[PDB]
Amino acid sequence: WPELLYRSIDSHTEDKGPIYNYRVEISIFFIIYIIIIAFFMMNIFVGFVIVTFQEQGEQEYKNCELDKNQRQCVEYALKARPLRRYIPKNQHQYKVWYVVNSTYFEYLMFVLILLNTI
Amino acid sequence: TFIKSFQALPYVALLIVMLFFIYAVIGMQVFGKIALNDTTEINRNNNFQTFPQAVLLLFRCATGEAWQDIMLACMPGKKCAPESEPCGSSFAVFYFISFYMLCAFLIINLFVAVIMDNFDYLTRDWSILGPHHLDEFKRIWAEYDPEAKGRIKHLDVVTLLRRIQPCPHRVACKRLVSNATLFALVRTALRIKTEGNLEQANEELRAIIKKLLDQVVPP
Amino acid sequence: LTVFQCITMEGWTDVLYWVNDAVGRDWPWIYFVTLIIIGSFFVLNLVLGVLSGEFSKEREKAKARGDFQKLREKQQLEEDLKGYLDWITQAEDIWNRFCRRKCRAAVKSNVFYWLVIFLVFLNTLTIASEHYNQPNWLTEVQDTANKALLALFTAEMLLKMYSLGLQAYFVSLFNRFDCFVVCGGILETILVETKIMSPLGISVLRCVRLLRIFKITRYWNSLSNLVASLLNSVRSIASLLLLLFLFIIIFSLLGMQLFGGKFNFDEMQTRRSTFDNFPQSLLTVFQILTGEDWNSVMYDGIMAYGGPSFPGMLVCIYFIILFICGNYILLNVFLAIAVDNLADAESLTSAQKEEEEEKERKKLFRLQCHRIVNDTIFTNLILFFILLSSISLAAEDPVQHTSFRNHILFYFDIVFTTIFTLEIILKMTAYGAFLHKGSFCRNYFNILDLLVVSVSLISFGIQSSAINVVKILRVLRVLRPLRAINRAKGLKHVVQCVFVAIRTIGNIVIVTTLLQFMFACIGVQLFKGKLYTC
Amino acid sequence: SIVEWKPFEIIILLTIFANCVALAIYIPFPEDDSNATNSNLERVEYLFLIIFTVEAFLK
Amino acid sequence: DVVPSMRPVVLVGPSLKGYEVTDMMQKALFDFLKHRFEGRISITRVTADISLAKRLAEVQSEIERIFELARTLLVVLDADTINHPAQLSKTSLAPIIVYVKISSPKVLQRLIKSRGKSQAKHLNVQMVAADKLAQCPPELFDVILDENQLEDACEHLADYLEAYW
Ligand SMILES: COC(=O)C1=C(C)NC(C)=C(C(=O)O[C@@H]2CCCN(Cc3ccccc3)C2)[C@@H]1c1cccc([N+](=O)O)c1
Ligand SMILES: CCCCCCCCCCCCCCCC
Ligand SMILES: CCCCCCCCCCCCCCCC
Ligand SMILES: CCCCCCCCCCCCCCCC
Ligand SMILES: CCCCCCCCCCCCCCCC
Ligand SMILES: [Ca+2]
Ligand SMILES: [Ca+2]
């Protein structure tokens, strides 16, 4: 683009070489275009794709049932399942577990990771 | 969530891969024999001589990196390759214009397809109950309960780690008394309706919408 | 600094080629390709996402003030006003004026409309016929065919005004624009015939002459609603653009303050994009904003403050704050404008075309012992043969003619062409072959399979002649991957949703490809051979 | 206090606009060079500092 | 009661017939109404105050001629006083009345300023009747006219006339 903006500012007259900065006002033609076809109309474009996809997606709106958040809520009837944590039994194996599972350890290890990056 | 959205549309990206393959092979067969020399853009770094090289050139064009100079360098009149016993085609316009119009389209098609698949998350008030609050409840429930071993197990109101968002006027007691506790909290904290008959309404709604143990869900 | 230059995807490929020269072609491509994919495309997808989320929150929060209802009320009012002015004008016709009650029907008749569309097409063809050194007869043809079309268009200006009511004919925005363009044509005639016409004149006058191509694209209704919304919310488009302009003015005054006259390096004056005066600073800031030579405009900005040092080369902060908070504001401005006006102007369509249709509705060989068995093993063997065929033509060697690998790939092509004829022979048992209703033809994908196989075979047939015709028949055999579209029930869904997207988008594409024609024609007027150089 | 009742805010905004235009015309010559216009703009700039410090006191 | 062999047709319009904004709409509908019911509709223009009806010296003999022409075998009556069914429904002539109304109160004044400013000051007197015509329920507003263009409302006027014929 700028290699052509400055061939067309030096542009002089039909079948004649260039003149340094003969007309800077020509830049307006290259600005308006850039604003219209490159910025405005190719963002109208993604906006149109977005709104069209949203319309394609709201076909299954299903207003007989209530809003979508309760839909996710009812879909999350599959929660409240157990999670393994291995609560320690040995006394020699519990102190270490507690100290490594405290935030006092994780803050320090974040600090050490940052120091190693440094 | 974006990684999940990307991994849930393995075919929108397959289309881009197919486009890159098609144009790489076409550029191979048409522009493959141009002469490698610098001061041009078909050089020892950019060329349609091997498939990896052509795909790199097309990735360069897709990111819009002086693709017009490649286009002007593949126009006819260029000296042909020495390993070929002139070369250069005027197709180089339609090959490089259309590609840029195609990729830049299929990219957007991809991006939006990943945005809107995910649009449940991107627009979200973060105030009404969502998966974050439910998972935080799951972890605190595990904190007060080992693996799948909570039936009643409750004699305390120390469940105040539930923040102000889901004891104000002992509505906590009302919610608690009136996995099963999870679904009860889901229905009650939303406070969708208040009619004194919403337990049977929940029964019928769960029956119609649903698949699992509903013998404990309403109570 | 180098990685951030790569992420913005400008200068990306230099620092890759330099590294290729330094340490060999083998590994570096992993580094830079992955950097571009993870850090440029992915974090641009994320940004589009977060912005669209914010805009879809703001749309819903815009159902509090109900501005969409205001726009709908105005649209219905401006429709009803002309609708009732039709009643009045059809009343006035009960100094005999029997001509109007016929000329109005002629106006509404489609024959007149298509005539005044064909005239527009002739206008375009006389404008587009510009040319660097056109034959002297073409110049007089263009002049006379410009005068004639201007006279006719004025004729159907006044005819349209008088067949309707002036106070009613100016109601429509489109007719107010058409009156403007024909008045511009009359002014063009005045200036060119008085010979006081200037290059700014030959720009703007011919420009409005082009704008008359908008006489097409008036049926199309989605874009009509879009333009209605744009003209409704112009008070906010103007504000957004003006705030952008102030941002650019600040980053250009600061540009002159920091880099004013500091770009004088003893090397030849290749620095066209300096910061010297204000108009040449605005072009440079705009070029940085669109990110074209952001590198070079930053390497010159650096080497001005001494080379790469500590105090110097802190003038990367300027070109990085600029490229960050100028592209962010560009994307924000031009997506808020293009979504808050393209989601409400699609609500107009979904609420008036629905309403109007509801209004009108409420007013009212051998066929024996076949083998179609085992269609679950062919349906995967064909895939794992198409993939290998695709890799096979991916493995050819262009630069050498009689390559060693080429013969092996020819052998593979023999094998795969035979095997892919096998299923064509097989599907004789299945209904088709232009027999049995022609079930073969009703689904074009099978015909396409046969077509690409037949081309791969016709190339073989010509190979006995061994002539350059195959030079094309070879290339087209790139069609081989597309067979998967038929054979993958998932890929079919995507490649059909793409065509649905194309058809739904088409109006915007037509507007853009017709609005680039005006800029092409204006550029031709302005630079019709003024770009040479010795 | 009653000064801000009067709509002068328009004149201070016009001062801002005149300052933008005074900055646009200023050509930054390479090494301490200057023309007549840059010489006048410094006196106009003292004027603008005056008209800004005054309103600073008032507000 | 008994139909007088036909239902007299009068058109209320958006407002008073004494101002051109309305009577032009009546003429516009009347032309197209008459050009498709040859032998089926006879159009007549009445001037006296037929609101004072029994079923004034000039009004004495006005009412009966409408019935006389209605018996002739539907019939269009063109008045200057019927601006609302109330000033016509007090007596049971059993007519059909075309009820022109404009769905918006805001296009009326825009129509007013259209031709000339001489009439402008009557807009309120123009509008009040429309307001006074606005709240009338449909059952006494039997002919429903909502849309904009003639070319379809003219077809709308066709259907009401074939309940018996
Ligand atoms: C008609 O295209 C033009 O005039 C344009 C030209 C040629 N140059 C540039 C780079 C523009 C552009 O962004 O190209 C786009 C790239 C994405 C796909 N786009 C539509 C498409 C989809 C599938 C297949 C083909 C095309 C075309 C404008 C433009 C701006 C904004 C919108 C727009 N549009 O087509 O809607 C077009
Ligand atoms: C002596 C004055 C000659 C130049 C007059 C103006 C020409 C340059 C204008 C540049 C406008 C660029 C706009 C940037 C984005 C708003
Ligand atoms: C002579 C040195 C050879 C080193 C070989 C390294 C191969 C891989 C290097 C680049 C990998 C970068 C991955 C970026 C993060 C995904
Ligand atoms: C935002 C970070 C980019 C710029 C940071 C400023 C770094 C300045 C020092 C870099 C080079 C030091 C001297 C190297 C020897 C020539
Ligand atoms: C609101 C209008 C502003 C226009 C410019 C204001 C400042 C101009 C002062 C200096 C003008 C340049 C000529 C200097 C004397 C030769
Ligand atoms: Ca770029
Ligand atoms: Ca570039």
Short mmCIF file of N, CA and C in Angstrom, two decimals, chain C residues 253 256 260-261 264 275-278, chain D residues 20 23-24 26-31:
data_model
loop_
_atom_site.label_atom_id
_atom_site.label_comp_id
_atom_site.label_asym_id
_atom_site.label_seq_id
_atom_site.Cartn_x
_atom_site.Cartn_y
_atom_site.Cartn_z
N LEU C 253 0.53 14.37 16.39
CA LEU C 253 1.25 15.49 16.99
C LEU C 253 2.42 14.99 17.82
N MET C 256 5.17 14.02 15.39
CA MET C 256 6.02 15.12 14.94
C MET C 256 6.93 15.60 16.06
N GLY C 260 10.18 14.54 14.45
CA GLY C 260 10.16 15.60 13.47
C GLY C 260 11.55 15.96 13.00
N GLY C 261 11.83 15.72 11.73
CA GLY C 261 13.12 16.05 11.17
C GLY C 261 14.27 15.23 11.70
N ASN C 264 16.58 12.26 8.94
CA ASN C 264 17.58 12.58 7.91
C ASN C 264 18.81 11.72 8.15
N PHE C 275 8.02 11.82 9.39
CA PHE C 275 7.11 12.50 10.30
C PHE C 275 7.23 14.01 10.18
N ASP C 276 7.69 14.52 9.04
CA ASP C 276 8.16 15.89 8.99
C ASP C 276 7.06 16.91 9.26
N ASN C 277 6.08 17.04 8.39
CA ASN C 277 4.99 17.98 8.62
C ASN C 277 3.71 17.22 8.93
N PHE C 278 2.64 17.97 9.22
CA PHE C 278 1.42 17.33 9.71
C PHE C 278 0.76 16.41 8.70
N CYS D 20 -4.94 23.13 18.99
CA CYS D 20 -4.74 22.05 18.03
C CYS D 20 -4.26 22.60 16.70
N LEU D 23 -0.70 23.79 16.86
CA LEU D 23 0.23 22.67 16.83
C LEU D 23 0.34 22.05 15.45
N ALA D 24 -0.73 22.04 14.67
CA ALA D 24 -0.66 21.46 13.34
C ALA D 24 0.30 22.22 12.43
N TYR D 26 2.92 23.89 13.09
CA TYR D 26 4.30 23.98 13.55
C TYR D 26 5.12 22.89 12.87
N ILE D 27 6.06 23.28 12.02
CA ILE D 27 6.91 22.33 11.30
C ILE D 27 8.16 22.09 12.14
N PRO D 28 8.44 20.86 12.54
CA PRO D 28 9.63 20.56 13.34
C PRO D 28 10.90 20.38 12.52
N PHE D 29 11.61 21.47 12.24
CA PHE D 29 12.79 21.41 11.40
C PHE D 29 13.89 20.60 12.07
N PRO D 30 14.80 20.01 11.28
CA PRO D 30 15.70 18.99 11.81
C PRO D 30 16.59 19.40 12.97
N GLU D 31 17.47 20.38 12.78
CA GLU D 31 18.43 20.75 13.83
C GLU D 31 18.29 22.23 14.11
#
